[PDB]
Amino acid sequence: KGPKELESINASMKSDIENVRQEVSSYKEKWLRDAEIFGKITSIFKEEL
Amino acid sequence: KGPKELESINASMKSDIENVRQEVSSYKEKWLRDAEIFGKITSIFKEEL
């Protein structure tokens, strides 16, 4: 492949790696807040079960 | 159908209608159990509010 072509794909792939880290962290945090509220409600009902 | 035959089934058909009334009572009991389940569902509903 042309080195200019290789440089362009390498640069893109780097940027894609970056967007991914941020997206994963945000998804994990939102999921965790929702999960904590869900778990408190799940606790009293779980004791009832 | 023979009237004797009809009289015999109507004894049994009336019995089946009584069984259906008993089943309706059972469904009401099931609804009451569902309502107890709904009262435990009530703590979850308070968390949701």
Partner: peptide, 29 residues
């Protein structure tokens, strides 16, 4: 009877939710 089955399903939904809480404790690690 279908309504009673749905109540049973909501209870089992609660069990699923408890399993989900255990799983969340697990993506916590």
């Amino acid at each position: 009877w279908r309504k009673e089955w749905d109540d049973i399903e909501m209870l089992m939904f609660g069990d699923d939710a408890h399993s989900m809480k255990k799983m969340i404790q697990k993506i916590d690690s």
